[PDB]
Amino acid sequence: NYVMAIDQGTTSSRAIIFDRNGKKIGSSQKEFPQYFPKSGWVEHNANEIWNSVQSVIAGAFIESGIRPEAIAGIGITNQRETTVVWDKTTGQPIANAIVWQSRQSSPIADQLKVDGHTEMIHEKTGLVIDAYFSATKVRWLLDNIEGAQEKADNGELLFGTIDSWLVWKLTDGQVHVTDYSNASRTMLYNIHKLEWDQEILDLLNIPSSMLPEVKSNSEVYGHTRSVPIAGMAGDQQAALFGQMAFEKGMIKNTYGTGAFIVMNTGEEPQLSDNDLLTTIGYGINGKVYYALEGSIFVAGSAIQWLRDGLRMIETSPQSEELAAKAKGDNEVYVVPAFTGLGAPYWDSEARGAVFGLTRGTTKEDFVRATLQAVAYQSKDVIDTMKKDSGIDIPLLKVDGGAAKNDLLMQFQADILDIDVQRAANLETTALGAAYLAGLAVGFWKDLDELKSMAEEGQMFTPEMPAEERDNLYEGWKQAV
Amino acid sequence: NYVMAIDQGTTSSRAIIFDRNGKKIGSSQKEFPQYFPKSGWVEHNANEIWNSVQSVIAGAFIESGIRPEAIAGIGITNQRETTVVWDKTTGQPIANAIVWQSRQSSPIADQLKVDGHTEMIHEKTGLVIDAYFSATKVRWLLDNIEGAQEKADNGELLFGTIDSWLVWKLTDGQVHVTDYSNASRTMLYNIHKLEWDQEILDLLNIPSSMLPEVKSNSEVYGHTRSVPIAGMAGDQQAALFGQMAFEKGMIKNTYGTGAFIVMNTGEEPQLSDNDLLTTIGYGINGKVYYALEGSIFVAGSAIQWLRDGLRMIETSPQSEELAAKAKGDNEVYVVPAFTGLGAPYWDSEARGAVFGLTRGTTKEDFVRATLQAVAYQSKDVIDTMKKDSGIDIPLLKVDGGAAKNDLLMQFQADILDIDVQRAANLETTALGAAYLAGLAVGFWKDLDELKSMAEEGQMFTPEMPAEERDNLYEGWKQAV
């Protein structure tokens, strides 16, 4: 009896599986190309997204010995606001999946700042005008291609952030679906009414025939060859809900292709006046809830910066190792605004660079800068998160492959101040295709049965000088 | 409609989509680690050999967009002798599967030569006592595990190679199926009676509650949540059928991981006196046939040994390049006997050594002697094939992964004094399983429709360096 998944990575395409509690048993890997067309924009081939996905979902479906009168339904997940527009008959893309990182969706976002849509999108969707969301990217795919717009009203090409491309191309094409936290981020949805916003949908000229069905986070959707379809619900509303949310004001910190923070702030929408996002979190049974997320584009897109291209070294894991020999960190920097800054700033124009260059360095320190800025950008939205709620909360319930360390939670631990809970296992964002969507088939009924084991097996303490954290923040707003 | 060809390899597997009449529309090939712990015992992880098939059935049916309503048949090809025994109603081993290369099935192979089973196995199974076959392994199995003997008489233990492992489960845990081709490779089978040999079984303490229900190569064994299973064979008995042989005297040569030369010798069991094998081949409908087989072990894994563990050529095609710079070997002969040295000689403790070493011998004379060693091993079984049947080979037909090498196929022509015929579709191992899948469903009905696809691309005629063929062959037999 299984409750598995999918999830379309921005870097890789991978896979896994569970049973009776806590025990480890099967893993992965496989990387697909980060295609590059032009300036601002990062692209992914929609075919090599789906080639890679069922290359690994047909894999972890099986990792140590058995098969099917076991399996029992299909959940889903995908990548940030990535618009895939495909045909209904063939299932072939008309264009590649324009990544969340992409900034060619800025000319169109500047036109929305001149009209007066800033106070309308922020009070109905809870977000902010920036080339990060799907709405600004679907217009792009519909203004450049020949047919698209009046193939859309006939019902040929369907919009759907990758999750819907994963539900659809699985079930032959039977169930075209979404959820409450994927849709709340497409910038075409209303966070309060729980349906698709028609007021935004006009201005951008996008139809209602293209849009997927927004169902419950926890509900049976369809059937196919794998067996019953089940659920999906926001990755940052996943490490948020991953180290246990359900109640008010709960937070975390992701450490992947972008390091993001979110806050499960009650069944009440908290409005941000100083550029933070308000999206949809999740409760205990199958009902809606709210969340305060910031957002950053580079962290693991940073675990996409020193190695391959400007080759320097030779194997993935080790890097906690060249770290033990030079304390004072020689006047170095980084603004990882590769494809837009993200953080409070936003500023879809600001790019990944920093000045101050002078004679006495080798092949060494900006490994520190490539390893410096998203707990400054996470900080920029964490010191925009707790302020957005008025809290003083305890421990960081961190997650992400960079903290394969006695040193990320030792450097991701130096100024934020208070102390963290290093998740001795760090993929809690991807905690999202085996509980919520496991409650409706009547096999456990509810999220209240196993507590006396969570020993966060890794923690590294503070030790000698204690008067230094302030001025080394005061000047980051001059590079940014 | 389409047909799924399933190739199961030794270093890299495959699963090509097959339309109507000879076209390969979607293929993907990936690898798995060739782990090595001790002197001559290489073992694949059994825990690693399906997916480069449903990472290519799923992953390739996606390169086009084909879901099960269009596939007419699923046909499996596999690496032989790699045994797999099992509990009947659950999921995992205590280890993993031995490659047809491993040499620790030799202690008991010594005990069998002391008893007097040499004239009993050579006349009933047609093989020879070596650590190459399944039976020699399946002794140090039931004598080497916590259960297995009385656990067998309880109805659990079920024997079967990789062919039987991809297909036993291809039903709701029901059908227990093998083919005539891979069954003869187990050394637990009778080649004349067409049933399982109780005369070998007993001696090794192996029950009857084990062994699978041996069926045909082309028959419907069940259904799959892919659509029917209708084709079964090994990577060498199907590549024999894929090269359009069946008829008396038609031979081939596959350069995958090892150079295997199989010859069709009618419906008559030809006895070998020049140290070859007598296995089961394939006919035209779905019946039994007999064949003579050469052997040995390392050929394509020798080019891979220079790539992974020695870091000499960086990529596999590059061995062709670093071979045309030296003109000769400069008295250097490499014996690829890393895991015994099969062929006409085959024993089990022989290791890989380099003969005729000099300091003036650059990295170019070593890389060439590794490719010529592939061509020298092919000679050892061709002159042996001529002495057993009595038919001299005019034109030698080839296929495989190391057949794309123009220098290996030119040297194979010069040292053999015989013409080398290379096909357009070199990866002919998957094609034999595709024709095996379609003949039981009713996709082609017979073979007279696939006669136009045996088109030869290039022809290698013996040039002038073919006069010094015996001077370079006698230096090889002194190194062996």
Q: Is A66 on the interface with B (CB under 8 A)?
A: yes
Are A58 and B65 an interchain contact pair (Cβ–Cβ within 8 Å)?
no
CA pair distance A74, B423, nearest whole angstrom: 44
HEC profile of chain A: CCCCCCCCCCCECCCCCCCCCCCCCCCCCCECCCECCCCCCCEECCHHHHHHHHHHHHHHCCCCCCCCCCCCCECCCCCCCCECCEECCCCCECCCEECCCCCCCCCCCCHHHHHCCHHHHCCCCCCCCCCCCCHHHHHHHHHHCCCCCCCCCCCCEECCECHHHHHHCCCCCCCCEECCCCHHHCCCECCCCCCECHHHHHHCCCCCCCCCEECCCECCCCECCCCEECECCCCCCCCCCCCCCCCCCEECEECCCCCCCEEECCCCCCCCCCCCEEECCECCCCCECCEEECCECCCCCCCCCCCCCCCCCCCCCCCCCCCCCCCCCCCCCCCCCECECECCCCCCCCCCCCCCCCCCCCCCCHHHHCCCCCCCHHHHHHCCCCCCCCCCCCCCEEECHHHCCCCHHHCCCCCCCCCCEECCCCCCCCCCCCCHHHCCCCCCCCCCCCCCCCCCCECCCCCCCCCCCCHHHHCHHHCC
Q: Which fold has domain A1-243?
A: Nucleotidyltransferase; domain 5 (3.30.420)
* Distance between B167 CA and the closest CA of chain A, angstroms: 13
Are A65 and B172 an interchain contact pair (Cβ–Cβ within 8 Å)?
no
For residue A434, with 0-12 CB atoms within 10 Å meaning exposed, 13-18 middle and 19 or more buried, which class applies? middle
Given in angstroms, what resolution was this structure solved at? 2.5
Residue B175 three-state SS: coil
Q: Is A249 on the interface with B (CB under 8 A)?
A: no
Q: What are phi and psi of A134, to 5 degrees?
A: -60, -40
Strands B229-232 and B71-76: parallel
Residue B409 three-state SS: helix
Are B172 and A64 an interchain contact pair (Cβ–Cβ within 8 Å)?
no
CATH architecture of B244-480: 2-Layer Sandwich (3.30)
Rg (CA), chain A: 22
A57 chain-B contacts, CB cut-off 8 A: 58
For residue A221, with 0-12 CB atoms within 10 Å meaning exposed, 13-18 middle and 19 or more buried, which class applies? buried
CB B240 within 8 A of CB B252: yes
How far lies A205's CA from each of A140, A193, A416, in Å? 11, 21, 44
The residue among B261, B269, B275, B272 whose CA lies nearest residue B289 is: B269
Q: Is B316 on the interface with A (CB under 8 A)?
A: no
Q: Which residues pair with A338 in a beta bridge?
A: A340
Q: Is B93 on the interface with A (CB under 8 A)?
A: yes
User: Up-side HSE of residue B27: CA atoms within 13 Å toward CB?
Assistant: 17
For chain B, give every residue range classified as CATH 3.30.420.40: 1-243, 244-480
Size of interface A-B (CB pairs under 8 A): 53
Task: Tell me how crowded residue A143 is: count the other CB atoms within 10 A of its CB.
Answer: 12
Task: Tell me how crowded residue A36 is: count the other CB atoms within 10 A of its CB.
Answer: 9
Percent helix, strand, coil in chain B (nearest 5)?
Answer: 20, 15, 65
CA pair distance B184, B431, nearest whole angstrom: 22
Query: What is the DSSP-derived secondary structure letter of residue B166?
Result: H
Interior angle at CA A92, CA A89 and CA A93, nearest 5: 125
Q: Is B57 on the interface with A (CB under 8 A)?
A: yes
The residue among B58, B86, B111 whose CA lies nearest residue B162 is: B86
- In B182-296, where do the E strands start and end? 213-214, 229-232, 254-255, 259-260, 262-264, 277-280, 290-293
Question: Smallest Cβ distance to A64: which of B59, B68, B91?
Answer: B91
Query: Whole-angstrom distance between the N-terminal and C-terminal Cα of chain B?
Result: 51
CB B423 within 8 A of CB B455: yes
Q: What are phi and psi of B209, to 5 degrees?
A: -70, 0
- In B217-363, where do the E strands start and end? 229-232, 254-255, 259-260, 262-264, 277-280, 290-293, 333-335, 353-355
Question: Smallest Cβ distance to A65: which of B58, B69, B91?
Answer: B91
Sign of the torsion angle spanned by Cα atoms A107, A113, A117, A122? positive
- Measured in whole angstroms, how far is the alpha carbon of residue B342 from the centre of its chain? 13
Q: Is A31 on the interface with B (CB under 8 A)?
A: no
CA pair distance A422, A404, nearest whole angstrom: 10
Neighbouring residues of A224: CB distance < 8 A, sequence distance ≥ 6: A74, A170, A171, A172, A174
Q: At what angle do helices B363-389 and B406-416 cross, to 10 degrees?
A: 50
CA pair distance B203, B212, nearest whole angstrom: 19
Q: Is A304 on the interface with B (CB under 8 A)?
A: no
CA pair distance A163, A50, nearest whole angstrom: 11
Are B92 and A64 an interchain contact pair (Cβ–Cβ within 8 Å)?
yes
B51 chain-A contacts, CB cut-off 8 A: 55, 58-59
The residue among A357, A352, A344, A350 whose CA lies nearest residue A370 is: A352
CA pair distance A5, A431, nearest whole angstrom: 10
Are B69 and A225 an interchain contact pair (Cβ–Cβ within 8 Å)?
no
Cβ density class B26-62: b for 16+ within 10 Å, e for less: bbbbeebebeeeeebbbbbebeebbbbbbbbbbbbbb
Are B58 and A58 an interchain contact pair (Cβ–Cβ within 8 Å)?
yes
Q: Is A47 on the interface with B (CB under 8 A)?
A: yes
Question: Smallest Cβ distance to A59: which of B51, B65, B90?
Answer: B51
Q: Is A67 on the interface with B (CB under 8 A)?
A: yes
Q: What are phi and psi of B177, to 5 degrees?
A: -120, 145
